[PDB]
Amino acid sequence: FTENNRYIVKTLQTDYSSGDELNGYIDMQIGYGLVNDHKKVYIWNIHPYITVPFPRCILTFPETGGLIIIKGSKAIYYEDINSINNLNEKFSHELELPINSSGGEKCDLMLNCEPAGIVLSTNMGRIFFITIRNSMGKPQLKLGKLLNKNSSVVSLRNGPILGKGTRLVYITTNKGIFQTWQLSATNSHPTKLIDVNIYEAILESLQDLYPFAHGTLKIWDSHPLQDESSQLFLSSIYDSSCNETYYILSTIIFDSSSNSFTIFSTYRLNTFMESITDTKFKPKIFIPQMENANDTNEVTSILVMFPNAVVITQVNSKLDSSYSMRRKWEDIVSLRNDIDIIGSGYDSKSLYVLTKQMGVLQFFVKE
Amino acid sequence: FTENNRYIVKTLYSSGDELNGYIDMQIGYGLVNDHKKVYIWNIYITVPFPRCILTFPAETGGLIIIKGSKAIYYEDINFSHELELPINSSGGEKCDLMLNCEPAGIVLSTNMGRIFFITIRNSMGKPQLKLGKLLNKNSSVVSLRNGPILGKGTRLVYITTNKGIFQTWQLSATSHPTKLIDVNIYEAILESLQDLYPFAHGTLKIWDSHPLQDESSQLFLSSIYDSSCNETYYILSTIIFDSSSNSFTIFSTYRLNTFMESITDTKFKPKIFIPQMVTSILVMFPNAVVITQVNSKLDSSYSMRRKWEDIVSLRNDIDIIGSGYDSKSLYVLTKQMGVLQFFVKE
Amino acid sequence: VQLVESGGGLVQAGGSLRLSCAASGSIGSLDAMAWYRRAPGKQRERVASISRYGTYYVDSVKGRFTISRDNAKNTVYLQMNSLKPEDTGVYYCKGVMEVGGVIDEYWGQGTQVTVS
Amino acid sequence: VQLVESGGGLVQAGGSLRLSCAASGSIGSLDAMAWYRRAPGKQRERVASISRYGTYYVDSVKGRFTISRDNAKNTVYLQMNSLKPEDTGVYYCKGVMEVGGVIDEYWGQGTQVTVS
Amino acid sequence: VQLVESGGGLVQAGGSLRLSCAASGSIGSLDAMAWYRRAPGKQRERVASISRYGTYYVDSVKGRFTISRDNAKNTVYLQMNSLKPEDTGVYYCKGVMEVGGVIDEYWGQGTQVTVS
Amino acid sequence: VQLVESGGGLVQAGGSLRLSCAASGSIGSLDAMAWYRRAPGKQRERVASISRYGTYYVDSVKGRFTISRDNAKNTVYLQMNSLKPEDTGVYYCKGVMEVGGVIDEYWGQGTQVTVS
Amino acid sequence: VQLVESGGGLVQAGGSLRLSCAASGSIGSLDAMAWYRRAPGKQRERVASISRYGTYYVDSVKGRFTISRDNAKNTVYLQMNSLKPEDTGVYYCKGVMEVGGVIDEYWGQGTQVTVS
Amino acid sequence: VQLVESGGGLVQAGGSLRLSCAASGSIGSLDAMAWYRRAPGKQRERVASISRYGTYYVDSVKGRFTISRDNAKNTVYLQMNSLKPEDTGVYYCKGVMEVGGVIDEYWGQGTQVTVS
């Protein structure tokens, strides 16, 4: 559709008739995408639109089934979405959450970390772990725990599965806090395997070359790498003198024995240097190759989604001494300043971006 | 005591560790308090029970103490009135700035940015403690200044916020407060600085304001920060206001040559003093006092004569807890080194 | 001290212009030089500025406008590439002098730039 | 000692890109740095260059592109505004050095730029 | 690419030193260079830094320390005037190189400075 | 052409000051700028100077004072660290211009510096 | 706005001179400055010139004459080494100013140079 | 690091010549560069030198020779005008660099210059 020697951008044909403010995303592991506004949610497998009327939603694993909806302080769970062509349709579980809806607080980020459960974060920084299976395969909606004791959570990611019902989950905050939690659906307690603050380290790595990093450095996102102990971070600094924004990818290696880390590598994007004025948008890291369990490729393609652009770069998969021996390329897909990105998704080969009026764009890195 | 050809510094008590106090030369008394008691003395009674303010007598009399959301007034400090304030004490909010603007009353500001006008006299000259009005509808008030007394019980008050809102209010004990001036000067100062100092964008902050000899002109103290070179610049902006059109013009802009360090102590607030109110302006910083001179009349001979800018450097030990002033000098209250007095010979 | 500008007019969308301003004055080298613009209805915004402490561009002209100055000479240039209709307005030049802490600003009288 | 370029990709007509090539290695400060391109079917042509003699632009990109170089560094930037479908092609960076009369060229691998 | 530091030792309170670090390697001019110190018991802090984007000093050494560097060679001098006992510590030099967005750090191995 | 000085005042022994003289006029960049002082009783001596031919310090202030000049501007700074009662006196600034061989001096009116 | 020239006189074959001219008046930095000469009988020819673009020398004086300029000052120098009798003539200084497109010339009255 | 000088050969009395030498290698900008000569029978003497402090000529060649260095480049030129038979000899180029206090000399192998 639109291709060069490195990647392909295809428009696809999906089209949702709503409206005038949309949210949504697309989960390729479950195999379904959903898009919702203030009145209804539309679900559809990525292989017409099944509707649930009534707000932030998430699909669960079951063949088809599973929808969680958070509205205010109320969470409602339908274990089988496949058992609905009804209008109401009330075979749901409910849970009142300790969310202060009157104080302007709303749910912001949420992750599906099955078989453990669901992790939610709020605009005020609180973090909830919620269980959907209750120690007997039964479907429930119980509060697991709180993981919080002008800062906010900016990323929630899945770690490896440590056993039956147990999984690691990574949490990153805008002020530089990084945590690796072990959560489980089973009768057990949450436990922090990693709890560090990487803010000062990235700051020290940038301060000599970019003094204006002090007072402007902010973390936007993080993403795990092929090694369980390594994480990628997306930060930004701002030079108010020249009115310039710099974006930084930092590869950090963690050590669960000593609860410590070391900055492995630091890269400043050459192709995108614009500030994020729309405070509702959060730039995101995508490593599609991370989805294939048997990934045997020397190069790792990372994509960064910005409100009107997708930056594509390559690094070495193995964080060794040959890492910087070969200089890599950095390309960009410049979208029209019109497109309103409302969500994203990804599989092992490509990235999917949901616009409000241009459909679902697919970025496929040929490698 | 310590003098050169331009000014004099005279040195002129018991400990406890947070301290709060000031010195009012118009009333003629100084005040200092901790968490337990307050000491008052004309320029040494003790009152136990927190932010205090001396009121005018009706020779000696009067003291207001604010603790949490409760204010208590003694018409004579040697039988009190009480008032519950809409201050959210559980939400970590405290009273921060307070001004005696008699005969109108008392004006308070909070850490959260709310402003209270409170009356102490109630239509008969009778001592009261009633709420007059709210004047508020990461910003905070940085200066509360008295203006002219415009009649029986009425007085002008100037309010300056951190972000640049400047307001001239006409308050009175007898009414309905009316804003005579309400402008935002932040963008104007920023425009005056952005070409020469591009790093002003994102760092410009207003610290204080002071009236000038003209009712329509004010002096503003601001700071900008250069993160590249870790430098802090301080800016005196002379601004002339027009009450008819609620407008203003930047008359002049001066960057201090002699003081350029940041204020890491987030509890300190630098202060302008113009004790004649040539015009000698002093600026009190945590560990220094900058003395500069300008022309009184804001005319065309304003910048015809270049003026000197000197500094009095104190030890980095001195903990300034408050200040005051009369018509010839400025008084600075330290915690352990007494009450320093700066007298500009002119 | 007087600022005098040159080089305005009417240009098609996608065209380019070059503005210049020269300060003939008794003083020395200006500390900063800048280009502001005022569109019809909108309020005057700085467009570009250059000084020892930095060179600034507004986002809306970033990459298309280039401000240059002739070292110590009191002439500043604004190269406007890929002009768009939203660039239409009256462009003013500003010079800023700082001596011993005293900061003075001087303005040109304006130049019309219309983009079709 | 390689030359590697960045900033290529996909844009729609009327958009903008910023190519950059910062390649360096053992070599000292290059005397000249340039951007060439090869359109599908056409022959390789110089787009822009910069040296101690000044910045050169081919006329087709004049008024739209800006070549710049961080002083003394072996890094060059090509800002392409208001792009046309005719700007599509493979863009190469070129560095040239003269020492003792000996003149050496250095080429990058190139980067694709596709305009819609 | 190593960094060799010189100028340490013992000095009386109120004295002065001049630290220097000049070592280089194959690659050209470093983009930034800085002095850090680790006092006995305290944590390692940046003391001064110099780069295209500015020259930073720590408030505790401001006015007494001067970081300088010639553009031609990768050498940094730290003139330390009016020394205090609080200045005693191990001083390290740090170079930072930036090539195409790749940012690399390099550290000297330290130099002891004792003040009486 | 006038010269006015700032930074003087009152300090205790071991403290710091930073004198600045930044005055200018219709003349160009001064060829040399210097700080002199007259102590109570003694004669006027040169404390520091800076010119294209070098930066001179008197031996009494070496390692404690630092003279600096803001590039081409007619603005000079004298950072005085670790002050003693011997540094008390009236400090003057001196500018020196050379045009076509004609050498002209310019003096400030002086600023008092007192140390305790 | 006047130009005065010095350095002339009489020299033997193989000697050297250094002509100089400094412009005085209410005017900024000249855009270009040049030296011309008129030999007995011949017509006025341009000997040397310096501007933004560099230095021009006529072939007959190339290698022996060096034109120099104090970048910001309105002072131009002409070092004349290894003089020949054919260099005898009246040497004029010329200054060229360009402001807002207006181009103005200024001449000195001339200085006699004789070579034996 | 090697030094090869060009420009030597034959010339008649009263003729001119230009020696040139460009350092090739990894080293940074040399701290000083000079031309020396060894006449037949006499000892090797420095004829010209250049460094940050300035340019030095020997009186034997002052007013007849001119040493110059390409701005921030390890390249020297020696323009020799008004030659004499006494100027015949082997001219060597010399580059001296000071790194961390260590002083290093580098000599070219020399070029013959003959004057008739």
Coordinates of N, CA, C and O in Angstrom, one line a residue, chain A residues 131-216:
Chain A
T131 N -8.4 -9.1 41.1 CA -8.4 -10.5 40.7 C -9.8 -10.8 40.0 O -10.8 -10.3 40.4
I132 N -9.7 -11.6 38.9 CA -10.9 -12.0 38.2 C -11.3 -13.5 38.5 O -12.5 -13.9 38.5
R133 N -10.3 -14.3 38.8 CA -10.5 -15.7 39.2 C -10.2 -15.9 40.7 O -9.2 -15.4 41.2
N134 N -11.1 -16.5 41.4 CA -11.1 -16.5 42.9 C -10.8 -17.9 43.4 O -11.7 -18.7 43.8
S135 N -9.5 -18.3 43.3 CA -9.0 -19.5 43.9 C -9.7 -20.8 43.6 O -9.3 -21.8 44.2
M136 N -10.6 -20.8 42.7 CA -11.3 -22.0 42.3 C -11.8 -22.0 40.9 O -12.7 -22.7 40.5
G137 N -11.1 -21.2 40.0 CA -11.6 -21.0 38.7 C -12.9 -20.2 38.6 O -13.3 -19.9 37.5
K138 N -13.5 -19.8 39.7 CA -14.8 -19.1 39.7 C -14.5 -17.6 39.3 O -13.4 -17.1 39.6
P139 N -15.4 -17.0 38.6 CA -15.3 -15.6 38.2 C -15.6 -14.7 39.3 O -16.8 -14.7 39.8
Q140 N -14.7 -13.8 39.7 CA -15.1 -12.8 40.7 C -14.5 -11.4 40.3 O -13.8 -11.3 39.3
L141 N -14.8 -10.4 41.1 CA -14.2 -9.1 40.9 C -13.9 -8.5 42.3 O -14.6 -7.8 42.9
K142 N -12.8 -9.0 42.8 CA -12.3 -8.6 44.2 C -11.0 -7.8 44.1 O -10.2 -8.0 43.1
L143 N -10.8 -6.9 45.0 CA -9.6 -6.1 45.1 C -8.5 -6.9 45.6 O -8.5 -7.4 46.8
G144 N -7.4 -7.0 44.9 CA -6.2 -7.8 45.3 C -5.4 -6.9 46.3 O -5.2 -7.4 47.4
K145 N -5.0 -5.8 45.9 CA -4.2 -4.9 46.8 C -4.0 -3.5 46.1 O -4.4 -3.3 45.0
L146 N -3.4 -2.6 46.9 CA -2.9 -1.3 46.4 C -1.4 -1.4 46.3 O -0.7 -1.9 47.2
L147 N -0.8 -0.8 45.3 CA 0.6 -0.8 45.0 C 1.2 0.6 45.0 O 2.0 1.0 44.1
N148 N 0.7 1.5 45.9 CA 1.1 2.9 45.9 C 1.6 3.4 47.2 O 2.3 4.5 47.3
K149 N 1.2 2.8 48.3 CA 1.6 3.2 49.7 C 1.2 4.7 50.0 O 0.3 4.9 50.8
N150 N 2.4 15.7 42.0 CA 2.3 16.0 40.6 C 3.0 14.8 39.8 O 3.5 15.1 38.7
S151 N 3.0 13.6 40.4 CA 3.5 12.5 39.7 C 2.4 11.5 39.4 O 1.3 11.5 39.9
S152 N 2.7 10.6 38.4 CA 1.7 9.7 37.9 C 2.4 8.5 37.3 O 3.6 8.5 36.9
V153 N 1.6 7.4 37.1 CA 2.1 6.2 36.5 C 2.0 6.4 35.0 O 1.0 7.0 34.4
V154 N 3.0 6.0 34.3 CA 3.1 6.2 32.8 C 3.3 4.9 32.0 O 3.2 5.0 30.8
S155 N 3.5 3.8 32.7 CA 3.6 2.6 31.9 C 3.3 1.4 32.9 O 3.7 1.4 34.0
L156 N 2.6 0.4 32.3 CA 2.4 -0.9 33.0 C 2.6 -2.0 31.9 O 2.0 -2.0 30.9
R157 N 3.5 -2.9 32.2 CA 3.9 -3.9 31.3 C 3.8 -5.3 32.0 O 3.9 -5.5 33.2
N158 N 3.7 -6.3 31.1 CA 3.7 -7.7 31.6 C 5.2 -8.3 31.6 O 5.9 -8.0 30.7
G159 N 5.5 -9.0 32.6 CA 6.7 -9.7 32.7 C 6.5 -11.2 32.4 O 5.4 -11.6 32.0
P160 N 7.5 -12.0 32.6 CA 7.3 -13.5 32.3 C 6.4 -14.1 33.3 O 6.1 -13.6 34.4
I161 N 5.8 -15.2 32.9 CA 4.9 -16.0 33.8 C 5.7 -16.9 34.7 O 6.5 -17.7 34.2
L162 N 5.7 -16.6 36.0 CA 6.5 -17.3 37.0 C 5.9 -18.6 37.4 O 6.6 -19.4 38.2
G163 N 4.7 -19.0 37.0 CA 4.0 -20.2 37.4 C 2.5 -20.2 37.2 O 2.1 -19.4 36.4
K164 N 1.8 -21.1 37.8 CA 0.4 -21.1 37.7 C -0.2 -19.9 38.4 O -0.2 -19.7 39.6
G165 N -0.9 -19.1 37.6 CA -1.5 -17.9 38.0 C -0.6 -16.8 38.5 O -1.1 -15.7 38.9
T166 N 0.7 -16.9 38.4 CA 1.6 -15.9 38.9 C 2.4 -15.3 37.7 O 2.7 -15.9 36.7
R167 N 2.6 -14.0 37.8 CA 3.2 -13.2 36.7 C 3.9 -12.0 37.3 O 3.4 -11.4 38.3
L168 N 4.9 -11.5 36.6 CA 5.6 -10.3 36.9 C 5.0 -9.1 36.2 O 4.6 -9.3 35.0
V169 N 4.9 -8.0 36.8 CA 4.4 -6.8 36.2 C 5.3 -5.6 36.6 O 5.7 -5.5 37.7
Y170 N 5.7 -4.8 35.5 CA 6.5 -3.7 35.7 C 5.7 -2.4 35.8 O 4.7 -2.3 35.0
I171 N 6.1 -1.5 36.6 CA 5.4 -0.2 36.8 C 6.5 0.9 36.7 O 7.5 0.8 37.4
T172 N 6.2 1.9 35.9 CA 7.0 3.1 35.8 C 6.2 4.4 36.1 O 5.1 4.5 35.6
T173 N 6.8 5.3 36.8 CA 6.2 6.5 37.1 C 6.8 7.7 36.5 O 8.0 7.7 36.0
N174 N 6.2 8.9 36.3 CA 6.9 10.0 35.6 C 8.0 10.6 36.4 O 8.8 11.2 35.8
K175 N 8.1 10.4 37.7 CA 9.3 10.9 38.4 C 10.4 9.9 38.5 O 11.4 10.2 39.2
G176 N 10.4 8.8 37.7 CA 11.5 7.9 37.6 C 11.5 6.6 38.5 O 12.5 5.9 38.5
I177 N 10.4 6.4 39.2 CA 10.3 5.2 40.0 C 10.0 4.0 39.1 O 9.1 4.0 38.2
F178 N 10.7 2.9 39.2 CA 10.5 1.6 38.5 C 10.4 0.5 39.5 O 11.2 0.4 40.4
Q179 N 9.4 -0.3 39.3 CA 9.1 -1.5 40.2 C 8.8 -2.7 39.4 O 8.1 -2.6 38.3
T180 N 9.3 -3.8 39.8 CA 8.9 -5.1 39.4 C 8.2 -5.9 40.5 O 8.8 -6.1 41.5
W181 N 6.9 -6.1 40.3 CA 6.0 -6.8 41.2 C 5.7 -8.2 40.8 O 5.6 -8.5 39.6
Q182 N 5.6 -9.1 41.7 CA 5.1 -10.5 41.5 C 3.7 -10.6 42.0 O 3.4 -10.6 43.2
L183 N 2.7 -10.7 41.1 CA 1.3 -10.8 41.4 C 0.8 -12.2 41.0 O 1.4 -12.9 40.2
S184 N -0.3 -12.6 41.7 CA -0.8 -13.9 41.4 C -2.3 -13.9 41.8 O -2.7 -13.3 42.8
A185 N -3.1 -14.7 41.1 CA -4.5 -14.9 41.3 C -4.7 -15.8 42.5 O -5.7 -15.7 43.2
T186 N -3.7 -16.6 42.8 CA -3.8 -17.5 43.9 C -3.7 -16.8 45.2 O -3.3 -15.7 45.4
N187 N -4.0 -17.6 46.3 CA -3.9 -17.0 47.6 C -2.5 -16.9 47.8 O -1.8 -17.9 48.0
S188 N -2.1 -15.6 47.8 CA -0.7 -15.2 48.0 C -0.7 -13.7 48.1 O -1.7 -13.0 47.9
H189 N 0.4 -13.2 48.5 CA 0.5 -11.7 48.7 C 1.4 -11.1 47.6 O 2.4 -11.7 47.1
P190 N 1.1 -9.9 47.2 CA 2.0 -9.2 46.3 C 3.3 -8.9 46.9 O 3.4 -8.6 48.1
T191 N 4.4 -9.0 46.1 CA 5.7 -8.7 46.6 C 6.6 -8.0 45.6 O 6.5 -8.3 44.4
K192 N 7.3 -7.0 46.1 CA 8.1 -6.2 45.2 C 9.5 -6.9 45.0 O 10.2 -7.1 46.0
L193 N 9.8 -7.3 43.8 CA 11.1 -7.9 43.5 C 12.1 -6.8 43.1 O 13.3 -6.9 43.3
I194 N 11.6 -5.7 42.5 CA 12.5 -4.5 42.2 C 11.8 -3.2 42.6 O 10.6 -3.1 42.3
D195 N 12.5 -2.3 43.3 CA 11.9 -1.0 43.6 C 13.1 0.0 43.6 O 13.8 0.1 44.6
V196 N 13.3 0.7 42.5 CA 14.4 1.6 42.4 C 13.9 2.9 41.8 O 12.8 3.0 41.3
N197 N 14.8 3.9 41.8 CA 14.5 5.2 41.2 C 15.6 5.5 40.2 O 16.8 5.7 40.6
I198 N 15.3 5.5 38.9 CA 16.3 5.7 37.8 C 16.4 7.1 37.4 O 17.1 7.4 36.4
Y199 N 15.7 8.1 38.0 CA 15.6 9.4 37.6 C 17.0 10.1 37.6 O 17.5 10.7 36.7
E200 N 17.7 10.0 38.8 CA 19.0 10.6 39.0 C 20.0 10.0 38.0 O 20.9 10.8 37.6
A201 N 19.9 8.7 37.7 CA 20.9 8.1 36.8 C 20.8 8.7 35.4 O 21.8 9.0 34.8
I202 N 19.6 8.7 34.8 CA 19.4 9.3 33.5 C 19.8 10.7 33.5 O 20.4 11.2 32.6
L203 N 19.4 11.5 34.6 CA 19.8 12.9 34.7 C 21.3 13.0 34.6 O 21.8 13.9 33.9
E204 N 22.1 12.2 35.4 CA 23.5 12.3 35.4 C 24.1 11.9 34.0 O 25.1 12.4 33.6
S205 N 23.4 11.0 33.3 CA 23.8 10.6 32.0 C 23.6 11.7 31.0 O 24.3 11.7 29.9
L206 N 22.7 12.6 31.2 CA 22.5 13.7 30.3 C 23.0 15.1 30.7 O 23.1 16.0 29.8
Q207 N 23.4 15.3 31.9 CA 23.6 16.6 32.4 C 24.8 17.3 31.8 O 24.7 18.5 31.6
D208 N 25.9 16.6 31.6 CA 27.1 17.2 31.1 C 26.8 17.7 29.7 O 27.2 18.8 29.3
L209 N 26.2 16.9 28.8 CA 26.0 17.3 27.4 C 24.8 18.2 27.3 O 24.8 19.1 26.5
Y210 N 23.8 18.0 28.1 CA 22.6 18.8 28.1 C 22.3 19.3 29.5 O 21.5 18.6 30.2
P211 N 22.9 20.4 30.0 CA 22.6 20.9 31.3 C 21.1 21.2 31.5 O 20.6 21.1 32.7
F212 N 20.3 21.6 30.5 CA 18.9 21.9 30.7 C 18.1 20.7 31.0 O 16.9 20.9 31.1
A213 N 18.7 19.6 31.1 CA 18.0 18.4 31.6 C 17.5 18.6 33.0 O 16.4 18.0 33.4
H214 N 18.2 19.3 33.9 CA 17.7 19.6 35.2 C 16.5 20.4 35.2 O 16.5 21.5 34.7
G215 N 15.4 19.9 35.8 CA 14.2 20.6 35.9 C 13.2 20.4 34.7 O 12.1 20.9 34.8
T216 N 13.7 19.7 33.7 CA 12.8 19.4 32.6 C 12.8 17.9 32.2 O 11.9 17.5 31.4

